[PDB]
Structures are given as C-alpha cells and as structure tokens.
Amino acid sequence: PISPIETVPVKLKPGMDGPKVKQWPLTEEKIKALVEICTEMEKEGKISKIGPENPYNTPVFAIKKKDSTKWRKLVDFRELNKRTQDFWEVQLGIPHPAGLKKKKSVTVLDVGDAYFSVPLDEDFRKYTAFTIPSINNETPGIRYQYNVLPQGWKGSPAIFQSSMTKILEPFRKQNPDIVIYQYMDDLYVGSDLEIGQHRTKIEELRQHLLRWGLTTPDKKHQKEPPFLWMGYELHPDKWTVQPIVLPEKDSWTVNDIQKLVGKLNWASQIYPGIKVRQLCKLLRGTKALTEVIPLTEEAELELAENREILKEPVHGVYYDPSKDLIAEIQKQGQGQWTYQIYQEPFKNLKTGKYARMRGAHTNDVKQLTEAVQKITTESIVIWGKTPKFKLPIQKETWETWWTEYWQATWIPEWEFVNTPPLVKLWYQLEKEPIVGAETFYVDGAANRETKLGKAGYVTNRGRQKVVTLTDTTNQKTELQAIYLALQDSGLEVNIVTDSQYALGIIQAQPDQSESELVNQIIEQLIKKEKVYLAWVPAH
Amino acid sequence: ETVPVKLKPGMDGPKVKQWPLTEEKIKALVEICTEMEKEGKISKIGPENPYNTPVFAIKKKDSTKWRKLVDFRELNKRTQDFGIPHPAGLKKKKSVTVLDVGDAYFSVPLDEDFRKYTAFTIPSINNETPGIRYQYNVLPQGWKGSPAIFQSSMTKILEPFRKQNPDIVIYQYMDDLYVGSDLEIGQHRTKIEELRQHLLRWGLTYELHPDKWTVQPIVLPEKDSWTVNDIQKLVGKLNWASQIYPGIKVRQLCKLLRGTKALTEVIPLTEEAELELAENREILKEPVHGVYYDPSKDLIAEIQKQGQGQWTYQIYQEPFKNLKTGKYARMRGAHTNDVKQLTEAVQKITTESIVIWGKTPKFKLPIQKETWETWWTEYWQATWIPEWEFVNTPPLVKLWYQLEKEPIVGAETF
Ligand SMILES: COC(=O)[C@@H]1CS[C@]2(c3ccccc3)c3ccccc3C(=O)N12
Numbered sequence: 007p008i009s010p011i012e013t014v015p016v017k018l019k020p021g022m023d024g025p026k027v028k029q030w031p032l033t034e035e036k037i038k039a040l041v042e043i044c045t046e047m048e049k050e051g052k053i054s055k056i057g058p059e060n061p062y063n064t065p066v067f068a069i070k071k072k073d074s075t076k077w078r079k080l081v082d083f084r085e086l087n088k089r090t091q092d093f094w095e096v097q098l099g100i101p102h103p104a105g106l107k108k109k110k111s112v113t114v115l116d117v118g119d120a121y122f123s124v125p126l127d128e129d130f131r132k133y134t135a136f137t138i139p140s141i142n143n144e145t146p147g148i149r150y151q152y153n154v155l156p157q158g159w160k161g162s163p164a165i166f167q168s169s170m171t172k173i174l175e176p177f178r179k180q181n182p183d184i185v186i187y188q189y190m191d192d193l194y195v196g197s198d199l200e201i202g203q204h205r206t207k208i209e210e211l212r213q214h215l216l217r218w219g220l221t222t223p224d225k226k227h228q229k230e231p232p233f234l235w236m237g238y239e240l241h242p243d244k245w246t247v248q249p250i251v252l253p254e255k256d257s258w259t260v261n262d263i264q265k266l267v268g269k270l271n272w273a274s275q276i277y278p279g280i281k282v283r284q285l286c287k288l289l290r291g292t293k294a295l296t297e298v299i300p301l302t303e304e305a306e307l308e309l310a311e312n313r314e315i316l317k318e319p320v321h322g323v324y325y326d327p328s329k330d331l332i333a334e335i336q337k338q339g340q341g342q343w344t345y346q347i348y349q350e351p352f353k354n355l356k357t358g359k360y361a362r363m364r365g366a367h368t369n370d371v372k373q374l375t376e377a378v379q380k381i382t383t384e385s386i387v388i389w390g391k392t393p394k395f396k397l398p399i400q401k402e403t404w405e406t407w408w409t410e411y412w413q414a415t416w417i418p419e420w421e422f423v424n425t426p427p428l429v430k431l432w433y434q435l436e437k438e439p440i441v442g443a444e445t446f447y448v449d450g451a452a453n454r455e456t457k458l459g460k461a462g463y464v465t466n467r468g469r470q471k472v473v474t475l476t477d478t479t480n481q482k483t484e485l486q487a488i489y490l491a492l493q494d495s496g497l498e499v500n501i502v503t504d505s506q507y508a509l510g511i512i513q514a515q516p517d518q519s520e521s522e523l524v525n526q527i528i529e530q531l532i533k534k535e536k537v538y539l540a541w542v543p544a545h
Numbered sequence: 546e547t548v549p550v551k552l553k554p555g556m557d558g559p560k561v562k563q564w565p566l567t568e569e570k571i572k573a574l575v576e577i578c579t580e581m582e583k584e585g586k587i588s589k590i591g592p593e594n595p596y597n598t599p600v601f602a603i604k605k606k607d608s609t610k611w612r613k614l615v616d617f618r619e620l621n622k623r624t625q626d627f628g629i630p631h632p633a634g635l636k637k638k639k640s641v642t643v644l645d646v647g648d649a650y651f652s653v654p655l656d657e658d659f660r661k662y663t664a665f666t667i668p669s670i671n672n673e674t675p676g677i678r679y680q681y682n683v684l685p686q687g688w689k690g691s692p693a694i695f696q697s698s699m700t701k702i703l704e705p706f707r708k709q710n711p712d713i714v715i716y717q718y719m720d721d722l723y724v725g726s727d728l729e730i731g732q733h734r735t736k737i738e739e740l741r742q743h744l745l746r747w748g749l750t751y752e753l754h755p756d757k758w759t760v761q762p763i764v765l766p767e768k769d770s771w772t773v774n775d776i777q778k779l780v781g782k783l784n785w786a787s788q789i790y791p792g793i794k795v796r797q798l799c800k801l802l803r804g805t806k807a808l809t810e811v812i813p814l815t816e817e818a819e820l821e822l823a824e825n826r827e828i829l830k831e832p833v834h835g836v837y838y839d840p841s842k843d844l845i846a847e848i849q850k851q852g853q854g855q856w857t858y859q860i861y862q863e864p865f866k867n868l869k870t871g872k873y874a875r876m877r878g879a880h881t882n883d884v885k886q887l888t889e890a891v892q893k894i895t896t897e898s899i900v901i902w903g904k905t906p907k908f909k910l911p912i913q914k915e916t917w918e919t920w921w922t923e924y925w926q927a928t929w930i931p932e933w934e935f936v937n938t939p940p941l942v943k944l945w946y947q948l949e950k951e952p953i954v955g956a957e958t959f
Pocket residue numbers: 101106107108109112113185186187188194195196233235240241242243673
C-alpha cells in the first residue's frame with residue numbers, strides 16, 4: 007500500500023551521523039498499545055522490523071487520542087532532524103484571499119497519510135529506527151525502521167510536497183481549467199466548470215492519486231465550504247471575514263490583556279476603527295503575567311466600542327484580472343497609515359494598516375513613500391502587479407519635495423484624491439537668507455561630563471540671551487540654542503549655527519523626530535512664515 | 546568536456562531568497578526556462594537541494610523579448626579564483642562599443658558537482674504554486690567561472706579580427722566585450738559589424754567614448770559682491786575641502802565673519818582675503834597629487850543626489866583621494882523616477898569603471914534599501930551586477946561636488 011514514487015536522495019548533515027538515544031521506558035499498557043499500532047504499520051509496509059544490525063535509535067512515546075481515546079504513537083525525531091541535511095525552504099508564504107480568482111466551485115481533499123504514503127530514501131531509513139520497550143526493561147526491545155516519510159521528520163514536508171507536485175504534473179496539463187493548491191496534507195481544488203463536470207474531475211483526481219497510493223478519506227472526514235483560511239471564510243465566489251469574539255470576563259490578567267491586544271491588533275487590519283491605547287495603558291509596571299489588572303473606565307469603554315465594531319460583518323470579492331487594481335491610502339495620524347485595495351469602488355479585496363512608524367527623524371511625505379512601497383511589495387506578491395495609487399497628497403507637494411530631497415525616492419503611477427487630511431510639507435526652509443528678517447547667531451555649549459551648558463543667541467539687531475542648563479548635552483544645548491532663537495524671534499528669522507545636527511535638519515527638514523527637543527524646534531519651524539537656517543564651521 | 550570547479554575553501558553554496566516578480570516577468574521567465582530545459586541547458590531539481598540564487602527578467606532596447614538575469618553575485622564570491630591584466634589603452638579610444646557575448650556559454654557543460662549551486666527559482670503569484678526549481682547543466686551567463694572556463698575558446702575566436710584590426714582593442718568582462726577604435730563614427734560601427742558577424746558564425750550577438758571623459762575641477766563662485774551668508778557658505782565648503790587639499794585656507798576670509806551682522810549684509814573683501822581665495826582657486830585647479838589606483842584594494846563608488854535630475858559621484862579607494870569624479874544628468878524619460886536615474890547612473894559608473902580598471906566598484910547609494918530592492922531591476926540593463934550599500938549622504942559632500950565645472954555652452958552638437 008506504499009508507492010511507485012521515486013524517492014528523494016536524502017543525506018546526513020556534513021560529517022554528522024545518525025542518532026543514538028536510548029529508548030524511554032514505558033508501562034505494560036503503553037507497550038501492548040505500541041506493539042499494536044506498530045504491528046499494523048509493518049504490514050502496510052510503513053515500517054520494517056530490523057535487528058541489532060542498526061546502531062541507531064529514536065525514542066517512541068505512546069499517548070492516547072481524543073477521537074477514540076485509545077493509545078496512539080508518537081516518535082520524537084528532534085535528534086535525527088538536527089542531524090538531517092537542510093532542504094529547500096518549503097512554502098512559508100501562503101495565498102491571500104485578495105489574490106484568489108472567483109471559482110464556480112471549490113473542493114478540498116485531505117491526503118491524510120500523505121507522509122506514510124510517500125517512500126523514504128532507501129538509504130536513509132536506517133537512521134529512522136525506534137525501539138518498542140519491554141515490560142520492566144527486561145528482555146530486549148522490538149526494533150523498527152521507517153520506510154516512509156516519518157511524521158515529524160525534517161525532510162517529510164518538503165519531500166511530500168515535491169512528490170505531490172510530480173504526481174499532479176500530468177493532471178495539471180491534462181486540464182488547465184482546474185487550479186490546484188497543496189497545503190500540508192490538503193489539496194484545495196477549484197474550477198470554473200459546472201458542478202457536475204467539476205465533481206467528476208474531482209473524482210478523477212481522487213482515483214489518479216489513488217493510482218499512486220495517496221488516498222482520500224470518506225464522507226465523515228470530508229471538508230465542505232466555506233473554508234477557514236487564516237482568519238477568512240472562503241466561499242468560491244466571495245470571502246467573508248471569520249467573526250472574531252472578544253471574551254467577556256470580569257477579571258483580566260496581564261496575559262489576557264496582551265493576548266487581547268494581539269487579537270485587536272490583527273483585527274485592526276480588516277477593521278481600521280479599532281483602538282487599543284487604553285488597553286495597552288494597563289500593562290504599565292505589570293509585575294507578572296498572571297497579575298490581575300482591573301480595566302479602567304476608558305479601558306472598559308474602548309473594549310466595548312470594539313465589540314460592536316467587531317460585530318459589523320466584513321465580506322469581500324476575489325480578484326478580477328480584467329479590472330483595475332487600485333490602492334487608496336489615508337494618513338490616520340502622524341506616522342499612522344490606512345489603505346484599502348479594490349477594483350470596484352467600495353468593494354475591497356484587501357484593507358490594511360501600518361503600525362505607527364516612529365524613527366529618529368522623517369517627514370510625512372517620506373513616510374507616505376514608505377507606506378506606498380510596502381503596499382507595492384504586498385501587491386506584487388499577491389497579484390504580481392502594482393496598484394494605481396490614490397494618495398492624499400497634491401502632485402505639487404509631491405513634486406516640490408522629492409525632486410529636491412537628498413534621497414532617491416519614488417511613487418509608482420499615482421493619482422491625487424482629495425480626502426482630508428491631505429499630507430503636506432509642514433514647513434520649508436528658505437533657499438536664501440531673508441533680507442529684513444533678524445539674524446540670530448546661536449550657540450549652545452555644555453561640558454559633556456558635567457552635563458551643564460548654556461544656549462543663547464546674539465542677533466544683529468541687538469537682542470541676546472543665555473540660559474544655563476543642567477543635565478543636558480552638547481547636541482541639546484545646540485538645539486536648545488536654535489530653539490530659543492525661534493521662540494524669541496518674529497515671523498521671519500535667519501538662524502546661523504555650527505550645530506552639525508542642524509545641517510541634517512537643513513537637508514532633510516524633518517516634521518517629526520525621536521527627541522521632544524527637535525520636536526519643539528519643528529513646532530517652532532512650522533509656526534514661522536520664513537526661516538533661513540545656515541551652517542558654518544565651528545571653532 | 547568539463548573542468549573540475551570548486552567553491553572556495555569552507556564556502557558553502559548560496560542560499561539567497563528570490564524576490565517577488567511581476568506577473569509579466571514570471572510568465573517570461575517560465576517561457577525562457579521551459580526552452581532552456583528543452584535545450585538541455587537547465588534541468589528541474591528536487592527538495593534535496595537547499596541552494597538558491599535570485600533571478601529576474603530584464604529587457605534592453607531593440608527588444609520585445611525578455612532576457613533572463615540571474616544574480617550570481619553571492620555565488621561568484623564563493624566561487625574559487627582562477628582573466629586578463631586589462632588593456633590600459635582601452636581608456637583612450639575615441640569611441641568604445643560594448644558586446645553581449647553571453648550566449649557563447651551554454652555550449653560548454655558545467656562540472657556535474659557544481660550544478661547544485663546554480664539552483665534558482667521561478668516564483669509564483671500569490672504563492673499559489675511552489676517555485677519551479679532548476680539548476681544549470683551548462684556555464685551560466687553572469688557567473689564568473691564562465692568567462693574564465695571559456696577564455697581560450699574566446700581567445701581563438703577573436704585573434705583573426707584582432708590581427709586584421711590591430712588598432713582596435715578587445716577587452717572582455719563577464720558576458721561583455723568592449724571594442725574600442727579611433728575610426729570615425731561610421732568606419733567604427735562597420736567594424737563592430739565585422740567583429741559581430743565574425744562572432745555571429747558561432748553563438749554570440751552601448752557606445753561610449755573614454756577619451757572624452759575629463760575629470761572636471763572645482764570652481765569656487767565669483768559673486769559680484771559678497772554677503773555674510775555668501776562667505777559663510779564659501780568658508781564651510783572650503784574648510785571641509787581642507788581634508789582633500791591641506792593648502793586650502795580660510796583664515797583671512799573667516800576674519801571677515803567676526804561680526805554679528807545680517808546674513809544679507811555685504812562684506813568688503815580685504816586684499817589679503819582675496820589672495821587667500823585666489824590661492825585656494827589655484828590649489829583647486831588640479832586633482833590632488835599622490836592618487837594611484839591600487840589593484841589590491843576595493844574600488845569605491847559614492848553617489849549624491851544633487852536634485853533636479855543631477856547626480857554626482859566619486860570613484861576612489863581611499864577617503865578623499867579620488868581616482869575619478871563626475872556629474873550625471875538623468876536621461877530622457879525619467880523626469881519623475883529617482884530610481885531609474887539612479888540605476889542608470891549606477892550602470893554608467895560601473896561601465897566607465899570597467900573600462901578603466903577592468904572591475905566593478907562597491908557602490909554607496911543615497912537611497913533606502915527597500916526602495917532600491919523593489920525597483921532597480923525594473924530599469925537594469927547590464928548583464929553584470931555590482932555590489933552596493935545604502936547610505937545617508939553627508940550634507941557637505943553634496944555641497945562640495947555640485948561645485949564642479951560644466952561646459953561653456955554644452956557640446957555644440959550641430
Ligand atoms: C490558489 O488557487 C488554488 O490553488 C485554489 C483552488 S481552491 C482555492 C484555495 C483554497 C485554500 C487556500 C487557497 C486557495 C480557492 C478557494 C476559494 C476561492 C478560490 C480559490 C482558488 O482558486 N483556490
């Protein structure tokens with residue numbers, strides 16, 4: 007009942023050798039149980055009884071199930087594995103509903119024994135030997151080695167998928183109209199043929215596989231649409247988001263809050279209306295996971311709002327290669343971005359949110375370019391295409407910014423969509439000195455060790471100032487200088503500084519940063535009607 | 546017959562990941578590969594092979610067809626060593642032409658044991674299908690062991706054209722052949738055809754002018770009247786420049802800045818202060834002494850975006866000791882695509898670089914890794930790929946080099 011499938015050449019890691027771990031002792035109950043399960047496998051050709059001619063071993067653990075609650079079998083190959091060659095990384099990236107195309111009908115075959123069905127490389131079998139213990143470790147144990155892909159073995163997933171692919175090859179060509187997806191033990195089949203035809207084609211596949219050993223279970227195990235695909239319910243002509251339930255408890259532990267926020271966060275993608283601020287202030291100063299933190303009123307609130315939100319149903323449409331692929335983005339708050347990708351207005355294939363990007367120093371447009379790139383990459387992955395962007399920024403602003411930004415940046419084909427708030431340049435340093443406006447020669451200095459300093463200015467007009475600072479830094483005294491010049495000056499100002507950090511501001515003009523200082527400066531910059539900032543060598 | 550080929554000691558084959566590709570590029574690659582498979586150049590492989598190397602589809606002018614491009618960079622580095630001392634005279638021809646002799650490789654089989662390491666992957670949309678895994682059976686374009694193992698064959702095929710035309714240099718690099726002669730624009734092209742035609746009777750099928758390349762100097766401004774700001778900016782530029790020309794001095798000039806006057810306030814240039822500037826200009830009339838290309842050190846290419854489609858770059862191995870420097874203006878059709886301009890500029894520098902020291906420079910790119918990795922390939926046209934790192938352009942570097950001189954009027958190209 008094995009197979010006529012060619013085996014894959016498997017080799018041990020470079021210079022390593024097979025495992026040699028003594029067998030764990032088990033009860034008389036667990037022994038007859040394994041002697042059971044196993045005595046079966048030997049017949050089905052899955053395993054072959056071997057003698058002390060094999061220096062290798064792997065521990066076997068007998069544990070019951072919940073289905074028949076009878077003793078099952080478990081083999082720990084953890085050792086053999088880390089002694090087993092590296093294979094080709096198996097599909098870790100799965101399909102996404104938004105990239106699927108509508109089908110007339112979809113099925114799903116469960117190639118359960120997918121593993122014990124595919125033969126193991128004849129030479130490698132020797133290493134997959136395990137020993138069935140004896141009562142009281144008395145007489146010797148019964149040796150066994152796998153002939154098939156062992157469940158839990160490193161090579162098993164990749165070697166089964168391969169075999170599966172080779173097996174499906176002919177069927178794939180004998181009829182393109184039928185799209186097939188292998189996922190672990192599952193084969194998901196879809197087509198745009200009428201149900202009668204499809205069902206028949208399914209049957210054909212089933213018997214074709216059976217022509218290679220691989221069999222499909224009965225009517226009891228069979229799965230029927232819609233399918234639960236990573237948070238989604240897949241209907242052949244539509245996807246619906248699987249409703250997520252938020253527990254209704256009276257005492258929340260830290261673990262509980264952290265697992266709640268996680269859920270909330272993922273939901274945030276499909277539902278951009280979700281909030282978690284108030285649930286996130288609860289983890290403050292927490293001393294232990296099992297700690298019980300009482301939900302504040304605010305936490306009790308948003309937790310509620312989210313429930314009703316998560317009530318609303320969210321369904322979707324599949325990808326029509328024939329229509330436009332569009333992607334619209336919204337700036338939902340400094341560094342917070344929302345995007346919905348669609349084809350038919352108001353009919354999303356996919357929505358999403360990017361965490362609040364918060365780095366050392368950027369501006370809202372560069373952040374927009376980043377949101378835009380990520381969506382591009384996701385899109386290329388999901389549809390092998392790049393959506394047409396609808397962005398809340400004016401072609402003018404875009405043009406002004408990038409054409410002159412120090413860094414190469416880009417936004418694929420895109421169109422302006424006037425949906426407030428639009429992203430804009432919060433300010434623009436003058437290109438040239440401002441005639442008329444006051445000139446603040448600023449300078450801050452501090453003993454980096456004592457952390458004492460002075461930040462001040464002397465204008466050409468006569469105005470001057472100096473403030474002593476404690477527990478500061480040179481960077482901060484310098485920035486404190488520029489900051490004072492900004493407060494004490496009118497709507498137009500010229501500031502000359504030797505601050506190297508200034509120079510960075512001049513070339514990147516950040517409208518947000520990690521330091522509250524630069525932040526203050528930025529707020530001041532945003533207020534002025536004109537600001538010319540100039541650098542000069544220090545000392 | 547195949548020559549034995551190994552990796553460097555203790556160096557394992559590349560296990561690099563395949564970037565996602567557009568539908569059109571996948572469709573094209575699948576086509577290109579089914580045929581190479583048909584033609585016995587590559588073969589499908591199993592899960593036992595853990596290796597992988599990036600691939601994509603490019604498309605140079607005069608083509609509706611797509612070319613497959615494998616990024617053997619990682620592999621090339623791990624590939625054992627084995628080329629020519631480079632024709633120092635190449636950098637002198639009135640006009641050089643590049644040739645893609647990449648196909649002259651599938652003829653030669655690849656040592657059976659090295660095949661695994663050439664494993665590549667044709668990605669699938671939405672992960673709906675696992676990759677179509679392959680590996681080469683022949684010498685692959687883009688691999689460095691190829692031009693080597695096929696050297697002699699290339700030697701024998703070129704001589705006849707070489708002797709008939711000794712006033713024409715034939716330098717090879719990767720899948721490329723650079724032909725440079727001093728014949729007139731027409732008498733030169735007709736010669737390429739003769740070399741190609743000659744090359745044509747086998748399995749092989751860019752026009753630059755090295756002697757035109759001139760390392761331009763730095764030109765300090767000469768305002769009508771100078772303001773405080775004017776000087777402050779000049780001093781900074783000059784002061785930073787000190788690092789390259791230790792003779793450049795800002796002493797006097799800096800003394801005209803000992804006043805808290807308006808930035809727009811005009812300042813009179815003292816006689817001494819003008820001498821100082823005069824001398825700095827002198828010092829800046831020629832490339833610094835002592836710069837010698839070391840073939841035992843990596844060639845470094847750094848670029849800065851000067852905005853408005855303009856780019857500047859320096860090729861060097863030591864800091865501030867430039868072997869070459871230049872300004873690059875974007876090409877027609879790229880007004881709104883920094884990435885395109887960048888890859889173009891990057892390809893030019895490489896090309897110039899190849900011509901001069903016969904090897905590619907490690908590049909320093911003023912672009913974000915994500916932005917580059919997502920779109921460079923969409924405008925790549927060369928058969929080779931240089932090494933690169935992404936960096937933040939320092940404010941002064943850009944300010945100092947946008948300073949270089951440009952044509953009096955242009956090129957007067959009637
Ligand atoms: C990707 O195309 C396929 O191979 C398969 C075939 S079945 C599946 C599918 C099932 C499970 C996971 C992923 C897809 C599907 C279901 C619902 C609507 C369309 C499709 C489709 O084309 N998919």
